[PDB]
Amino acid sequence: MRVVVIGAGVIGLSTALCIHERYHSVLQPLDIKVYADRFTPLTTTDVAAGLWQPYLSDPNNPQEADWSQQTFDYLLSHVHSPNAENLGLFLISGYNLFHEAIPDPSWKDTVLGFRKLTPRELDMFPDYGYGWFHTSLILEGKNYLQWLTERLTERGVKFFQRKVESFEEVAREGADVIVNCTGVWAGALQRDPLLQPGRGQIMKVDAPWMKHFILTHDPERGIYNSPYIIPGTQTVTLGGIFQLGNWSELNNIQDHNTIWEGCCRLEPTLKNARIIGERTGFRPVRPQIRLEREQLRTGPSNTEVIHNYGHGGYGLTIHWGCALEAAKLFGRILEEKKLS
Amino acid sequence: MRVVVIGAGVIGLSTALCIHERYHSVLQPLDIKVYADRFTPLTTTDVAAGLWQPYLSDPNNPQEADWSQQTFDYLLSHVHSPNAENLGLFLISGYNLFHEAIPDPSWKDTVLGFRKLTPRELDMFPDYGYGWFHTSLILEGKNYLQWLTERLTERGVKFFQRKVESFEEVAREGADVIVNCTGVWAGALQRDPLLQPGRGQIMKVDAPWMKHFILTHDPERGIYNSPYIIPGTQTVTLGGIFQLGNWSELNNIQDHNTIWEGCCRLEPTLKNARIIGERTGFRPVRPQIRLEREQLRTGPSNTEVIHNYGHGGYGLTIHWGCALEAAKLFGRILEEKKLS
Ligand SMILES: Cc1cc2nc3c(=O)[nH]c(=O)nc-3n(C[C@H](O)[C@H](O)[C@H](O)COP(=O)(O)OP(=O)(O)OC[C@H]3O[C@@H](n4cnc5c(N)ncnc54)[C@H](O)[C@@H]3O)c2cc1C
Ligand SMILES: Cc1cc2nc3c(=O)[nH]c(=O)nc-3n(C[C@H](O)[C@H](O)[C@H](O)COP(=O)(O)OP(=O)(O)OC[C@H]3O[C@@H](n4cnc5c(N)ncnc54)[C@H](O)[C@@H]3O)c2cc1C
16 A cells, blocks of 8 residues: 655645555555655745634635634643644634624634623724634644654655656555645646635734734725734744735735835734745645545546545645544545455 | 831832822921842842732732722722823733632622633633633833933932931931831841742843733742743743742742743743843742831931831732821821921
């Protein structure tokens, strides 16, 4: 049973880990390899703050809400272990601000102590007249990716640095199952018109007195096109950029100024903070995540494919539920091949 | 009108400032000097984490409830100014954990979004079954003391490093009003058996993922004698030491281990944290703060004295209201001396 995972971000690596730990005992030769063009420092996953929070409006598919729930409950049970620091995982409380009232989110019972903001709290944010407060989790991609890598290494999983031209090429070399975790680039292996870049840009700043997150919202501009501030372990993320269709992997001055001005209005104490870095990434926007099987018909006998991509702006939020779902699908492949 | 302020802790400097800012225009020669033994890096105020939170049970003097409230609103309306970093002021949320049920505190409407810990939250803490959650402020003494200083310096307040043997000495040399802000050492100038040292021993640690304060309680052990973790700007404070009558200003190994063990139990990710430093200090314990006028019968005409000491383990929490009251008492002196 040769299994090739394409992609080394949160989705690929988490899926790879789930598959190994769940099926390495019920398969004699279980060889899992990971192919990726880019690894642990240079992925979209690295650009993410790693704040756990789904989109405001309900998901196109009600499964995602469970995958999110599952992810939260899992990371929560581990928040207080010694692993936590290596993971980059910790608790954080903060604000979601709006101009008008809005219905409570679906995940309001997932997070800790969800409530609405009080007048005193609102006075701290004059540009806004409504919002929430709650306690969530942060999984910093850069450390989490490092953890996964090392978990996988000790499990015999080999990593190879290469760009895959097609599924057929990988099947031609001997893969029985191909797990597709190519994020926003998935379309280069199989035309997917529903998958598009959600380009974002962020600023890492030194502001260690920030202990709360602050997400602003505005329908007039779109999800995550509003200033936000996310305290990390070493630095603070400043963001607020979302651009459908933009494939430019390049820091932009205009976006720089938008991040910087937005967040300063929001938190005046930021004016003297020192700028550590700046990065651009592409959210794999898709009306819903593609998490399904497909039999790639090719020659004598076809090869199995599990697609796992299109997690948009909530990959770290949902990755675990997805992995478990991918592993179940892997489960079914085995029983059909009558190997369980 | 010669005013001599004794003491350079948060109480001395804030009182000094609050008096100068309010009466320099209504008095032609208002020459204010600060006399102190120890200054801005080596005082009790420097050892304090700076968390705003009064004692758990109501104070035998209900003016204190107001003095703390006045302090909270003052710092809160300054949290988003460009001066916040300079003062060491910032918002922080966190947990108060208890074994049994306890009644809500008097200051429950002062803080932001005070509420009870939900079952899910309490599970993060196995050794506790009750508690609160809210949003407070931190005012780090070291920064604050430095800010107060530069403000006084530019107001023309002169500082002098010297140990004052008696009030008589200070009147004898020309003081018309003496402000007594000598903290726990007040008794060396005027006998007062109620004022006693509450020794503490904190530990500064590098754990930048900690975003919440965690305070544990136990009546079977005493106030601030139970483990607590308070995240600061550059480092995290670990404490839980309150010893009545102990005058030893020296770090104790047994206290170390107690701090270190109780905080690890409470937050296991602490195990691998780097220890930056450790310090001892003396809370000026008194059943209530002495903030009152007195006449010293020194020579032909008596000199005025404003006493402001005995702030216990809540001096930063209450400092501003005290300084306003002292200033008010300074005004009552003026009109009586026929100078208002
Ligand atoms: C600015 C920004 C902020 C974000 N903040 C958050 C947040 O706070 N919380 C949250 O949950 N999410 C956040 N996200 C979203 C999150 O970053 C993504 O949903 C997640 O990173 C996507 O993971 P992925 O593994 O699918 O893709 P990626 O992390 O991009 O990994 C894709 C992998 O596939 C490889 N690959 C692609 N094609 C090939 C090929 N042909 N051959 C070989 N390898 C290939 C790439 O090299 C890479 O290794 C943010 C995104 C951005 C841009
Ligand atoms: C471990 C610890 C943690 C704490 N944490 C907090 C907290 O989180 N929040 C909070 O609100 N409070 C906290 N406190 C309490 C706080 O530190 C004290 O309440 C406060 O600092 C007292 O201020 P002060 O100005 O009276 O005295 P100090 O800061 O001790 O200053 C006294 C001044 O008087 C001078 N002086 C005294 N006698 C003479 C003399 N004869 N001649 C000349 N000068 C003299 C001294 O040199 C010094 O300059 C904590 C205390 C400790 C020990």
